[PDB]
Design a protein around this nucleic acid. Structure first.
Lengths: 79, 47, 137, 155, 113, 119
RNA sequence: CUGGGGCGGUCGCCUCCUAAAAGGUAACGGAGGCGCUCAAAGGUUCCCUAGAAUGGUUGGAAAUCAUUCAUAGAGUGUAA
């Protein structure tokens, strides 16, 4: 009479990028959902309590490099 | 770990509820909260 | 009788058998060795069975090298019960070998003596082999 | 003296660190304070919490994560400590050796094999406490350090 | 006090201070000090101001000083090496006077057993 | 043989950590102050563009004067104050480089505070 | 619910692998956790940064260390 003990699992949290690079977004729009500092915040970009990247100014997104092995997302007011 | 209700002296309403350890701090907790009606940081006391 | 002292997981996923050998396609210890030409799973029982048949005819007159070690253990359900009840217990340890991989390596013996000793150990292996010598060109 | 190209390449004596060893206050309630006062009886400084009871680096009996005392003496107090180390500390020793590696506590490998508080004679002490005094110098070489160990004071 | 430089025993028998000092084994401890009112009430340096001075004059006036007696004793070791006895070839090894190497072990001189 | 450590090295590191959430920007420029073992230098810099628009030091020809080795700082602060008063003497962020706020820097910091520099 | 039913075992939430470089994805597939704790383990200002081997407790070959390497090897109230 063989038994089991590995049929438990949690729900999946839709993580990853929510906005593409070069797309127009409005202030308050989420840009990234992660568990830690996978992507640092750039210009006009704040960090939430759950390490969520959001925009504060309406403009276009821009994913660039910060340092040598760290990425960062910023937003520019220029339409 | 039990519930704690910070009572007021002028307000008379329990709009501030927190938690604490009876085994750790068995004495009454006394902090300075803010009662909107009085609109002044008053000294609240646990019942 | 070759098996790891301890492993993190006792249940693997069965190593894939495709492509060519990743590395170890040249003899670097002995002068002659057995090179595989087909892909199959080599168990520890067969590995020790071929080694005992090689030393028996060599009469302790040379050095033997094994370039393969069972790293993946496989399970097996006994007494053929109904399917769907979880994984079974470990049965033994195997090792995937792809074409171009050297199996054994002999040294300090006659060239014709190593050609006969390797032929006796090739009859206890389930893969087509080929006698090769140290290349240098 | 030995071909120093300037008048600032001459070696100096970096610091002087010493105090009691274990003085385990887990069963010695007042012996901790007693050893503290004994360390304060050679040089007047409050005793801190560190392993300053060795003859050099670390190479003795292991354990780790203890709770002893230590003292930092590096100015003109250090010169006076050396003077008292040639007076009271050569009353019972009378044996100048030579080494420059490790001793009690690349170190961290021991906390045993020390002295027995000889200058703390049982004239105002309740016990004997290992208080090996580590020598800190600006010595760029252990044999140059040995040359300084016999220089201006007992071999 | 200054009887031996650093008083070993403290607050105990007055003649117990000469017991820790080498050269006497409590056999001539009360036969060296014969000064007026030379008593003792378990107080070596307690209840006393001037008494060691006379003890330092009788210990210096005696044939044996305290270090010279051990000096000649540690100088006859090589002086007794004229193919005689005094552990000529005993101390070097482990065997000691009494031939206790067969009765048991060498408690006198034994490096590691 | 315990070796000594550079004082400017550690200071630089600390300064970099304090410059992670503080920078000048035209309207609110940063007042960087460099204190040496002889004199002290100060200059209003604009991080946004990267160009200085002010300069004041204790080794200046109109500042060099056998003082009490602390009065110079006060003068230095008042010296740049007037220079900054000419153009752009409003809200400004004071930078303490990497040293402590107590000491000669304090005197130089309060020197502009009593001059009128709204900071 | 269930590779017929019974017997057994499970039934909610959290992390990883399977999952095929966005996200999502099954089985009585493979591994672990939670049913809290904390008046400082909170807020703010300021300042700090393992293992090897030699003055030997005949020695656990890591007492609370001197300063080399640390180059982060640590550390984080808790599983990943």
């Amino acid at each position: 009479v063989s038994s089991t003990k590995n049929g438990r699992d949690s729900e999946s949290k839709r993580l990853g990028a929510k906005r593409a690079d070069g797309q127009f977004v409005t202030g308050g729009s989420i840009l990234y959902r992660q568990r830690g500092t996978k992507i640092y915040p750039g210009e006009n970009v704040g960090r939430g309590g759950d390490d969520t990247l959001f925009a504060k100014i309406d403009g276009v997104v821009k994913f660039e490099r910060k340092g040598r092995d760290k990425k960062q997302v910023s937003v520019y007011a220029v339409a | 770990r039990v519930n704690v209700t910070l009572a007021c002296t002028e307000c008379g309403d329990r709009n501030y509820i927190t938690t604490k350890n009876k085994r750790n701090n068995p004495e009454r907790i006394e902090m300075k909260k803010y009662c909107p009606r009085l609109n002044k940081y008053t000294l609240h006391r646990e019942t | 009788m070759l098996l790891p002292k301890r492993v993190k997981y006792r249940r693997q996923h069965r190593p894939k058998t495709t492509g060519r050998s990743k590395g170890g396609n040249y003899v670097t210890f002995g002068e002659f060795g057995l090179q595989a030409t087909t892909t199959s799973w080599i168990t520890s029982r067969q590995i020790e069975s071929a080694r005992i048949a090689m030393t028996r005819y060599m009469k302790r007159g040379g050095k033997v090298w094994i370039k393969i070690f069972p790293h993946t253990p496989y399970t097996k359900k006994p007494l053929e019960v109904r399917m769907g009840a979880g994984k079974g217990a470990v049965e033994g340890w195997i090792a995937v070998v792809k074409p171009g991989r050297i199996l054994f390596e002999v040294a300090g013996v006659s060239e014709e003596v190593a050609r006969e000793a390797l032929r006796l150990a090739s009859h206890k292996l389930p893969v087509k082999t080929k006698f090769v010598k140290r290349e240098e060109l | 003296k030995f071909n120093y190209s300037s008048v600032m390449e001459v070696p100096k004596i970096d610091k002087i660190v010493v105090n009691m060893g274990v003085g385990d206050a887990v069963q010695n309630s007042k012996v901790l304070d007693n050893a503290v006062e004994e360390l304060e009886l050679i040089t007047g400084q409050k005793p801190l919490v560190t392993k300053a009871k060795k003859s050099i680096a670390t190479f003795r009996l292991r354990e780790g994560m203890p709770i002893g005392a230590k003292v930092t003496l590096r100015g003109e107090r250090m010169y006076e400590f050396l003077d008292k180390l040639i007076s009271v500390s050569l009353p019972r020793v009378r044996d100048f050796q030579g080494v420059s590696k490790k001793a009690f506590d690349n170190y961290t490998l021991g906390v045993k094999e020390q002295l027995i508080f000889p200058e703390i004679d049982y004239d105002k002490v309740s016990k004997v406490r290992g208080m090996d005094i580590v020598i800190v110098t600006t010595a760029n070489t252990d044999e140059e350090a040995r040359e300084l160990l016999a220089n201006f004071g007992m071999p | 006090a200054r009887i031996a430089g650093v008083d070993i025993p403290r607050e105990k028998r007055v003649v117990i201070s000469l017991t820790y000092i080498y050269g006497i084994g409590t056999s001539t401890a009360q036969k060296i000090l014969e000064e007026a009112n030379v008593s003792a009430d378990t107080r070596v340096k307690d209840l006393t101001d001037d008494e060691l001075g006379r003890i330092r004059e009788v210990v210096d006036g005696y044939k044996v000083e305290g270090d010279l007696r051990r000096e000649t004793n540690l100088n006859i070791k090589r002086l007794m090496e004229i193919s005689s006895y005094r552990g000529i070839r005993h101390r070097r090894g482990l065997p000691v006077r009494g031939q206790k190497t067969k009765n048991n072990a060498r408690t006198r001189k034994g490096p590691v057993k | 043989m315990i070796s000594k450590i550079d004082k400017n090295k550690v200071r630089l590191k600390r300064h970099a950590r304090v410059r992670t959430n503080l920078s000048g920007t035209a309207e609110k420029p940063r007042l960087n102050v460099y204190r040496s073992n002889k004199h002290i230098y100060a200059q209003i810099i604009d991080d946004n563009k990267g160009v200085t628009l002010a300069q004041a030091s204790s080794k200046d020809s109109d500042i060099a004067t056998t003082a009490t080795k602390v009065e110079l700082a006060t003068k230095v602060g008042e010296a740049i104050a007037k220079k900054a008063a000419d153009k752009g003497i409003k809200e400004i962020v004071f930078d303490r480089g990497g040293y402590l706020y107590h000491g000669r820097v304090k005197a130089l910091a309060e020197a502009a505070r009593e001059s009128g520099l709204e900071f």
